[PDB]
Symmetry: D2
Subunit: 328 residues, 4 copies
């Protein structure tokens, strides 16, 4: 059949639904920021920083330059879309209220550059976003960003890995897109991706083992020493949530950042890290839990609230929930 | 100061050493293969595979291998190639024969290709020392005889680490220029890091020394905080992190891989060379990796490398358990 | 103010006009084809043709491969847009009727790779297009493409020169966009371009001088030997219509391909060469004539009809038309 | 055969000639400047000038920014090569003497961005250079650049057209290289190009016709009104010397910028425009004359000296020279 780019694919869906165009305009702007971020992440123009024309400007805090630039690309592209009223960024203490003359109907929570500890060693990094409609009748404020994940209008992520990929869901499953750098556009590469029912990879930072609860300690023990005669799982932990979650999506398995003694509410952020990937994984037939309730059912209380995160193949998450139940 | 590209930087060193030019020509060809691999890894031209011009035809391991073999053979600098991808050694035709042997993994971290995690290219270069006809025995030199070694990391950006025996230099591909820019000269690994890197899914197959060492990283005996864990699943990605952040990377023997998994010629020796050139250690647990005398081109060996105090602590666990 | 990409700019206009989305979707597909042509024109992937991976495949005819590739890119992207019913291409003898299941309401006339004699010497080349609404109630046929240029819905061109530019008009002047290759998208760089009233450059192939009519001969002589102490015009003739016309738009002056004894009907094509650039030049405040009437007023009679073309700064075209009347 | 990049192709020649490597290092540095120029010419990063991250920085004079940037790229890359002692640039009034600690043995005359009047309309532009060995025993001075073109060690040009090409000669014919933007390297596409004995294209600015001498007037008249039953020549004048000269090389024909009443010594510059392309055209078996002697034999007297230029296919230049003798 036909070769489809992301914005054409979105336009076709927004037209058949006879929508206003505002979501399409918002998403198109986000992808323009994503292309710009990807180009900077891949180090376009670096020779000019190192004095090819005689002006040396070597960068000191490259995680700071890149997350500051990323944040500006996303904020500027979204505000200029005329589609937004409230933005929440991993990089900003307070919610960002769109100027009245550019105001639209959507709230966007995003991490402009996820996996910052991987910037200097060049491992995979990413951008994560979740989109809500403003539902309150009042003035736009940070309370409009405090909806639970079941109300997501669209969510997705960009992975700046060995290639640049976008996963996107509007409520009808997960579609994958690859950036063709020679074309400059995202090509639709996989429709309605479905996670494996059960995987063979478990993904978590085991340096927190002395702080784990008993259920987490038990679950990891089962992965290494199956009570079963089956082979133990392989372990993977890239250290970028977007990279590890995407691997979980396309290979199956489980990803965990549980609460521990030093992080009793988890580390990952509910609004702009856990909810979007929980939405993506569940749309693909997976599960996402805090260990006591579904992530998407949590009512947020603060825009930078933390939550434990366990997600992936449904059977793997189910075994983890059983470990939680068995340990009180 | 001046902006230096990789090939200019190598040319100046090869000139001041008054060498024949053959190493420079080999390296320039390898870098051309790496640029081509990087472009393919980033999926340039993917829209034509998906029918933008009307021909739908929806591989990377094979292409990388052909890119490296063709660029190396066409350099006129090679006599024997050993690739992760070929059962036998590849002898260069006489009209293209030069004096160097190259061992390479054209695309390391192959289980990470489909999930778009970091992958890489690894290589080690030797001079042919035998007087006979070129054969695979020319590739069986131990890592002490490396002329040059390095790797390409196709991660969030494309980087090359390179050593010719005088430390490790790092270069970044500026995709708008099309050339690798020198970004750091003579990198030194930290004495001690705070990250440990290995596949803990083999925990039931570990020997006691590995088991004890992993336990010490999680439950330190000295009130200090436990190490963080990272395991990308690509040796090149994990080793390069070890180089620039410090810490330790391990693929020890286990019950199912009693001589290890990683390959001595084109995986362990090149990264062992790099890590030692940066002031770190690389051991099999009983001797330095670079001292292992190869016996077959696809020989496996255990690999533990990184910051020297961390490797020293692992060796203490090895000895404490015999 | 805001940084706008072509598709963002078009969506905004299509929203405020409350359209169905079909033109925006058509244009979006055309721009994807143009980006793909631009990448091939700049020779992306040439190293693989010359055997970098061991497969040598040097093209014996560069001009044949590129216009065949260009033609396929445009046809495939337009048909796949679901916006077209009839295509007229410089490369196809008959009109191309879209398959029934992909039919939309628009007719597109295009030259996919104009300036073919400049391909092997690497001078500027381009893509030209004009868009019409289907007017018949019947089955689509080539009669839907035989409308005169006054009925153009949208027209423009891509110039693959020292950089890649698109000029576009939907009836409210001419806008210029530049392709940022590091971003992969066209950026709006100039709104509502206006041609100079009078220029100082004349552009025509004087190797046909022995075939010119008397008026053309007189006009050219006036440009070299002015009778009013003013300096003679400079001459430029790139040999690619898109390049020479675009210089005319942004620098002023006149471009001519008049009838001559060997081309008594002119050389350039009415549907997908003369009408589109006539539309652009008039939208910018210039004139476009065949020497007896405005180009946009000619009623097409066959899809590959030729017509004389004189266009550019209004005062220059008028001096030429004065020469035409003066010589009967 | 094998896929050869420019720097590999040069290294192999420099090895078999067992030279010091200094010329190779110089050329490699020059190609880096050319790659950087091509990227800027194609407008990489333009979206950041137009505020994609919120920082608008639209440039007023585009021809001023690009030729200043070009000039800086060439000067810095060449000086940093440690291969140069004297540089002459179209953009600098005085010769540029390399600092003592970076001094090498070569003198470089270059036009970093030829065809500047074509920058804003996106027609083809280029870079021209000629390399000489310092032969004086004295201190480096501009006199080291005043050698005549017979003493050229290497010369060539970059054409930033529909694709980027480099023409290069070290004295054994002309080789052509194309920049593959996906690889970032120049691929050898044609070895030892030879110009046609006689062409069918003539190329000059006929807007100076009232200022031509009699021989030029007669030669142009013969091209349009042949007295021997042959067809008249076609005319082309891009307006960028590199583009017009390169077309002359690969298609045949003639390019002329003769002296005229307003430019009694010609317009084009001997050191960094006429000598380099004269070298290229002669290496390919063509001719390059001032109308009274071969261009390569003129002994320069000032670094910015002008000279008339007539070059191309030998039979075409000879017909021009016959007109010069015929008019005294
Ligand atoms: C049932 O699955 C789906 C999937 C996707 C969607 C949607 C995507 C975008 C929207 S939208 O609200 O922004 N509307 C529009 O974009 N309209 C337009 N008019 C003209 C043009 Br051109 S685009 S709805 C709806 C349902
Ligand atoms: C002491 O640290 C080092 C580091 C690197 C090297 C080397 C790199 C390449 C070589 S080489 O053998 O290929 N010779 C050359 O390339 N010669 C040349 N002539 C002209 C040109 Br232009 S390059 S030696 C030597 C010593
Ligand atoms: C007065 O000057 C102008 C200039 C341009 C236009 C037009 C451009 C495209 C069209 S259209 O017909 O395709 N419809 C739409 O694009 N609808 C949409 N809805 C939502 C989204 Br998001 S796009 S109309 C109209 C008038
Ligand atoms: C017979 O026609 C020709 C054509 C070209 C040339 C030349 C090109 C460059 C030079 S050079 O002087 O710079 N020396 C070198 O490059 N030496 C090197 N050694 C090792 C490496 Br690796 S490069 S000579 C000579 C003769
Ligand atoms: O180092 P630990 O504690 O494992 O945290 C890793 C997690 O933190 C994040 C949060 O963004 O990365 P980082 O702190 O490196 O920015 C996630 O990408 C990653 O999953
Ligand atoms: O899956 P496990 O056994 O951890 O092996 C991972 C190791 O194997 C290698 C060997 O190439 O990758 P892979 O099998 O994924 O291609 C190394 O890059 C990586 O470090
Ligand atoms: O060679 P002449 O007759 O001047 O033709 C020039 C005209 O023909 C065209 C027709 O497309 O070029 P070409 O045949 O070289 O592709 C126009 O771009 C150009 O304006
Ligand atoms: O406008 P005219 O006088 O024809 O000058 C054209 C010549 O001048 C040059 C000199 O660099 O261009 P320009 O003045 O446009 O920079 C040559 O490229 C071109 O051949």
């Amino acid at each position: 059949t036909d070769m489809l780019t992301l914005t054409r694919y979105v336009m076709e869906k927004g037209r058949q639904a006879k929508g206003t165009g505002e979501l399409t305009q918002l998403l198109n702007s986000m992808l323009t920021a994503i292309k710009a971020i990807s180009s900077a992440v891949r180090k376009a123009g670096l020779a000019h920083l190192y004095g090819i024309a005689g002006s040396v400007n070597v960068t000191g805090d490259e995680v700071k330059k890149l997350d500051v630039l990323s944040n500006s690309l996303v904020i500027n592209m979204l505000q200029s879309s005329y589609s937004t009223c409230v933005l929440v960024s991993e990089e900003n203490k307070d919610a960002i209220i769109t100027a009245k003359e550019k105001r639209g109907k959507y709230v966007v929570c995003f991490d402009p550059l996820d996996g910052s500890s991987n910037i200097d060693c060049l491992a995979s990094i990413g951008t994560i976003f979740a989109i809500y409609r403003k539902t309150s009748e009042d003035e736009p404020s940070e309370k409009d960003a405090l909806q639970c994940g079941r109300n997501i209008v669209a969510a997705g992520y960009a992975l700046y890995g060995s290639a640049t990929l976008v996963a996107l869901s509007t409520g009808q499953g997960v579609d994958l897109f690859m950036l063709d750098p020679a074309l400059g556009e995202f090509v639709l590469v996989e429709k309605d991706v479905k996670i494996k029912k059960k995987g063979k990879i478990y993904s978590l930072n085991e340096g927190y083992a002395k702080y784990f609860d008993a259920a987490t300690t038990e679950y990891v023990q089962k992965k290494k020493f199956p009570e079963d005669g089956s082979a133990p799982y392989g372990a993977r932990y890239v250290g970028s949530m977007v990279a590890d979650v995407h691997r979980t999506l396309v290979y199956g398995g489980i990803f965990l950042y549980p609460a521990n003694q030093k992080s009793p509410k988890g580390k990952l952020r509910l609004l702009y890290e856990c909810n979007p990937v929980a939405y993506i994984i569940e749309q693909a037939g997976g599960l996402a839990t805090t260990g006591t309730q579904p992530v998407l059912d949590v009512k947020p209380e603060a825009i930078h609230q933390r939550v434990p995160l366990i997600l992936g193949s449904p059977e793997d998450v189910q075994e983890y929930l059983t470990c939680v139940q068995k340990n009180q």
